[PDB]
Amino acid sequence: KSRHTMSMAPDVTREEFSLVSNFFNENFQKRPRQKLFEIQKKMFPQYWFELTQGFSLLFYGVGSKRNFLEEFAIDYLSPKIAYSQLVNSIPCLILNGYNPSCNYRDVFKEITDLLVPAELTRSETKGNHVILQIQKMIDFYKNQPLDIKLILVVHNLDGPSIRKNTFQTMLSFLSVIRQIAIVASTDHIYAPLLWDNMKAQNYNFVFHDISNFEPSTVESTFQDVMKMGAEGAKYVLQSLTVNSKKMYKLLIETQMQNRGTQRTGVELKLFNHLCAADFIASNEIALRSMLREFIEHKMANITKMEIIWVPYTYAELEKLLKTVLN
Amino acid sequence: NVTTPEVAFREYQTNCLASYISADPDITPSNLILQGYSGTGKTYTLKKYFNANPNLHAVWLEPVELVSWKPLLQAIARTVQYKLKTLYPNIPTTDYDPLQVEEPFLLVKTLHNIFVQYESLQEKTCLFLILDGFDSLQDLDAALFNKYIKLNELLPKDSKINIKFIYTMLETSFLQRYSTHCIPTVMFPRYNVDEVSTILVMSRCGELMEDSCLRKRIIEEQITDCTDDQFQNVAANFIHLIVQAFHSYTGNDIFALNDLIDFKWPKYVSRITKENIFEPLALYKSAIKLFLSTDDNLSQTYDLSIISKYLLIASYICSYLEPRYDASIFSRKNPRYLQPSLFAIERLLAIFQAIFPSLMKANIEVFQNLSELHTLKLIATTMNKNIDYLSPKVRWKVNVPWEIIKEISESVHFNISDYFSD
Amino acid sequence: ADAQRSHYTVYPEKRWELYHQLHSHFHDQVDHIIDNIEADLKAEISDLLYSETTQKRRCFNTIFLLGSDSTTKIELKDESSRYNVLIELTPKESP
Amino acid sequence: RITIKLWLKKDVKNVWENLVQLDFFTEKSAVGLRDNATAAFYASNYQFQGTMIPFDLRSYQMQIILQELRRIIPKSNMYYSWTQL
DNA sequence: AAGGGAAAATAAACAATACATAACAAAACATATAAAAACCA
Numbered sequence: 001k002s003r004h005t006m007s008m009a010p011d012v013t014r015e016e017f018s019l020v021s022n023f024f025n026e027n028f029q030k031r032p033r034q035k036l037f038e039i040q041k042k043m044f045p046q047y048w049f050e051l052t053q054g055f056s057l058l059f060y061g062v063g064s065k066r067n068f069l070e071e072f073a074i075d076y077l078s079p080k081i082a083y084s085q086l087v088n089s090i091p092c093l094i095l096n097g098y099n100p101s102c103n104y105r106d107v108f109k110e111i112t113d114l115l116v117p118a119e120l121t122r123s124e125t126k127g128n129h130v131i132l133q134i135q136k137m138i139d140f141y142k143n144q145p146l147d148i149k150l151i152l153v154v155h156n157l158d159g160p161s162i163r164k165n166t167f168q169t170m171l172s173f174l175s176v177i178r179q180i181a182i183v184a185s186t187d188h189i190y191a192p193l194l195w196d197n198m199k200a201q202n203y204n205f206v207f208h209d210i211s212n213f214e215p216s217t218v219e220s221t222f223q224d225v226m227k228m229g230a231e232g233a234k235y236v237l238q239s240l241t242v243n244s245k246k247m248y249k250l251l252i253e254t255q256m257q258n259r260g261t262q263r264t265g266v267e268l269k270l271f272n273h274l275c276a277a278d279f280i281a282s283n284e285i286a287l288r289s290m291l292r293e294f295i296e297h298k299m300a301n302i303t304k305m306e307i308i309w310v311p312y313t314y315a316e317l318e319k320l321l322k323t324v325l326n
Numbered sequence: 327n328v329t330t331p332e333v334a335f336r337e338y339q340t341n342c343l344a345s346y347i348s349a350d351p352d353i354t355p356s357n358l359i360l361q362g363y364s365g366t367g368k369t370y371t372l373k374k375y376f377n378a379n380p381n382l383h384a385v386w387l388e389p390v391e392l393v394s395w396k397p398l399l400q401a402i403a404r405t406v407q408y409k410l411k412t413l414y415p416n417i418p419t420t421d422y423d424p425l426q427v428e429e430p431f432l433l434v435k436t437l438h439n440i441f442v443q444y445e446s447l448q449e450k451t452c453l454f455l456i457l458d459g460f461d462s463l464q465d466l467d468a469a470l471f472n473k474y475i476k477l478n479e480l481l482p483k484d485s486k487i488n489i490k491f492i493y494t495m496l497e498t499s500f501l502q503r504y505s506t507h508c509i510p511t512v513m514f515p516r517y518n519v520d521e522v523s524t525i526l527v528m529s530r531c532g533e534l535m536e537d538s539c540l541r542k543r544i545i546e547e548q549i550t551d552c553t554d555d556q557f558q559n560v561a562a563n564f565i566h567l568i569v570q571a572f573h574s575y576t577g578n579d580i581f582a583l584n585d586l587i588d589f590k591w592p593k594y595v596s597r598i599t600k601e602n603i604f605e606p607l608a609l610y611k612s613a614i615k616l617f618l619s620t621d622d623n624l625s626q627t628y629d630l631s632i633i634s635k636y637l638l639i640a641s642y643i644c645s646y647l648e649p650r651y652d653a654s655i656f657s658r659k660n661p662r663y664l665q666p667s668l669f670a671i672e673r674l675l676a677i678f679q680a681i682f683p684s685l686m687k688a689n690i691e692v693f694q695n696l697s698e699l700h701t702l703k704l705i706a707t708t709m710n711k712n713i714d715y716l717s718p719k720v721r722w723k724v725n726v727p728w729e730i731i732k733e734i735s736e737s738v739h740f741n742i743s744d745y746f747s748d
Numbered sequence: 749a750d751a752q753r754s755h756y757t758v759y760p761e762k763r764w765e766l767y768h769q770l771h772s773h774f775h776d777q778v779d780h781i782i783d784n785i786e787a788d789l790k791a792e793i794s795d796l797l798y799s800e801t802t803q804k805r806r807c808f809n810t811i812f813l814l815g816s817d818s819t820t821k822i823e824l825k826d827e828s829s830r831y832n833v834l835i836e837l838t839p840k841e842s843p
Numbered sequence: 844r845i846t847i848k849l850w851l852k853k854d855v856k857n858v859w860e861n862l863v864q865l866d867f868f869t870e871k872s873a874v875g876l877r878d879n880a881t882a883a884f885y886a887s888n889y890q891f892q893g894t895m896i897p898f899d900l901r902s903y904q905m906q907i908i909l910q911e912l913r914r915i916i917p918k919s920n921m922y923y924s925w926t927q928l
Numbered sequence: 929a930a931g932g933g934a935a936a937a938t939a940a941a942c943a944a945t946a947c948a949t950a951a952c953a954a955a956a957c958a959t960a961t962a963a964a965a966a967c968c969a
């Protein structure tokens with residue numbers, strides 16, 4: 001099974017990747033991107049009018065929408081609605097769904113403090129009373145004068161914590177209230193698996209496409225691939241004793257004398273004698289103790305001759321030869 | 327020496343319980359096992375002893391109305407000082423908190439505190455504790471039952487009042503774990519077909535001759551002055567037939583007979599005549615219809631919509647259709663008994679797009695009815711019910727039997743039995 | 749800059765009026781119909797919860813509300829010299 | 844080969860209920876009794892999958908094997924030809 | 929119309945992966961009491 005693999009790739013370090021990535025995402029398709037941004041700007045009065053009807057507005061589409069939501073929520077809408085009702089403008093409570101550390105307790109503790117504490121609602125705070133406390137919020141809000149006092153934003157609604165099911169139903173009861181406007185965005189292709197006709201009854205979602213093919217700068221940070229071990233032990237050797245460099249150099253030679261697999265490895269006895277030959281290893285214990293340091297940071301393997309072999313590729317070890325060992 | 331009662335079918339077992347229980351503590355063995363399944367009247371035959379013995383004192387506890395051992399200790403310690411108040415009201419007491427105990431040390435800590443002020447009594451009096459239903463405690467384990475055996479020996483043995491136990495449990499696989507302790511057991515056998523009917527007639531004559539549903543039907547029909555014995559006969563003719571037309575359905579139960587009587591009784595009452603009171607055999611021939619049906623079940627055409635109906639009919643396909651065969655037989659160019667296999671996502675829409683009447687492309691409402699079907703628990707997740715949205719490794723599966731699929735196939739005129747081929 | 753911190757708040761027509769006289773007027777017809785079924789559902793549970801005097805009187809009364817949306821709220825009678833309480837148990841609280 | 848009431852589907856369940864609590868059958872992978880308290884408490888929070896498949900598909904296994912039934916069931920009973928295969 | 933013959937199907941041994949649950953950890957939720965700390969007075 002001769003497969004080309006990501007290990008057999010010309011790799012790129014940390015500062016080299018992120019800088020040339022920053023060059024593309026700020027200079028690749030710049031002119032048509034704001035050219036799209038001016039086209040969709042005329043839809044902004046249409047969103048203002050429908051949002052008076054308490055409609056949970058939901059934005060789908062390819063690409064990141066994070067920049068677009070923050071322009072649309074903060075600068076455009078939130079002072080426009082305060083001027084049209086008649087003083088600080090309408091409070092914006094974003095929810096970063098790409099941040100996995102969102103819970104149901106903490107954000108709702110913000111909500112009841114963002115909303116009015118007209119009564120002693122801490123008396124009803126008791127043991128899951130969250131649905132209980134919001135139910136007492138809802139029926140009171142059915143008989144209030146209709147005006148928006150809060151707009152909340154939920155970025156990346158299919159996020160790693162917001163897509164949890166006890167959190168989803170929590171947002172469902174918020175959306176039936178007329179005083180708050182719910183402007184959220186998702187990115188998943190299976191996002192309408194999240195809602196049944198029970199929740200969408202509470203939601204009354206409407207949909208709009210926004211596809212600007214954004215790079216998702218902030219949304220790439222928490223995500224990881226093998227760019228983010230061959231690269232792990234690449235830094236430990238840069239800070240050690242000078243003898244460990246030499247005893248790894250003698251290790252890496254005869255382990256690449258023969259991918260870097262088990263079969264190219266060496267026996268412990270002769271390697272003790274080999275590192276006794278260059279006046280390096282005194283005995284087995286002095287060898288093994290500064291070999292456990294290569295073991296503790298998982299920089300070498302052993303299987304069974306008593307074969308110690310390096311788990312990095314054929315291409316990687318000669319890169320480890322000519323750069324850091326030399 | 328004790329005053330034994332007498333009951334219907336416990337003639338051996340009344341003797342042993344009179345044997346293994348005396349008011350004297352020295353003759354009284356410490357721990358005891360009353361074993362038998364539900365449907366033997368052990369709670370009946372135990373209390374029936376105790377009403378005939380007013381000399382002893384019984385404290386009745388009920389584990390089935392508790393949930394755990396931590397209240398069960400609180401159940402014991404609250405009651406003995408409750409009982410000993412009502413047995414020796416002259417004795418002064420530093421009443422302790424039964425809420426305070428939560429650990430098995432704390433009981434014998436508190437029973438060391440309780441019994442010492444009661445030391446001034448005149449003779450060694452015993453005190454029988456009764457636990458009813460020790461196997462159906464809902465947090466039981468291996469190391470709880472032995473934990474209650476040795477409680478007697480941690481007590482001081484020379485106290486004037488001695489606490490001893492009687493354990494009621496069932497599921498005799500459980501008792502086989504503890505036969506090496508060799509505590510004295512009195513097993514209670516199950517019943518036979520006659521003695522089920524014999525128990526049932528002497529226990530249900532007191533209600534079924536005195537029910538107003540009879541008493542209405544007395545004055546509603548032309549009432550001949552039929553005797554209570556004439557009421558006794560038709561009651562006995564009812565019981566001796568209802569156990570005969572149903573014994574294979576119910577086994578040797580008593581509880582399952584005590585309610586099936588109270589379902590078929592007024593429906594039996596309406597089909598009597600003025601004349602069939604003297605005519606019992608023809609009365610059964612006129613009231614026949616209830617004696618061959620169970621009448622315990624209080625087949626739905628399902629509420630869900632059309633696109634959701636085809637959403638169900640594609641989900642049943644992967645109870646037998648493997649990925650090796652399906653794409654060949656469903657081109658756009660038997661495990662009916664067995665447990666269903668595991669889905670993944672988009673294999674549904676792989677089959678759903680094929681079997682739908684290019685005529686459809688919008689899949690927003692199709693995605694709507696999935697989690698609608700998830701709330702109906704007709705298709706459920708293999709894993710926990712939380713992260714199933716974002717496509718991590720999540721496998722799906724149906725939970726509907728074949729018949730409800732078969733009606734719902736013809737309810738949308740779709741044919742399914744062709745594609746199931748052994 | 750701050751976007752990795754989660755949930756940080758911040759504190760930054762001739763035609764349409766003829767819509768406004770039509771929209772709410774329609775919605776007065778909506779919600780008045782909504783309380784009708786709300787009064788309907790609250791009524792038919794309430795009479796049926798009471799007046800059912802069975803003869804054995806050692807059984808609970810059960811009610812199956814078929815086709816119901818799992819959100820149907822209930823009110824209770826006062827019915828003095830006896831407290832009448834409501835307990836709700838959501839499958840989230842059924843471990 | 845001959846008048847015997849063959850029963851339905853909706854009723855055998857009532858007989859099937861007593862048979863599993865007479866321990867003539869077991870559930871397939873069911874550790875019965877935990878040894879101590881905190882091992883049993885770790886099994887209480889665990890939501891199960893066998894209840895999530897329906898009643899008629901819980902894979903029940905056997906406590907009393909077929910060949911031993913021939914030795915206890917008398918030959919006077921009509922099903923004695925069915926003890927042996 | 930016959931027929932070649934490649935796609936499709938079947939079976940069986942073996943390897944690789946997923947799954948159900950056991951065991952546990954940890955955070956949310958909850959109470960208790962002696963010591964600090966305000967605080968009237």
Ligand SMILES: Nc1ncnc2c1ncn2[C@@H]1O[C@H](COP(=O)(O)OP(=O)(O)OP(O)(O)=S)[C@@H](O)[C@H]1O
Pocket residue numbers: 333334335336363364365366367368369370371525529580581
């Ligand atoms: N010898 C008898 N005479 C009269 N009635 C009896 C006799 N034996 C049993 N019964 C009846 O059988 C009924 C069964 O009562 P239970 O004690 O609950 O049965 P069980 O086998 O103990 O099941 P439980 O409650 O789960 S332990 C009693 O209520 C009595 O009415």
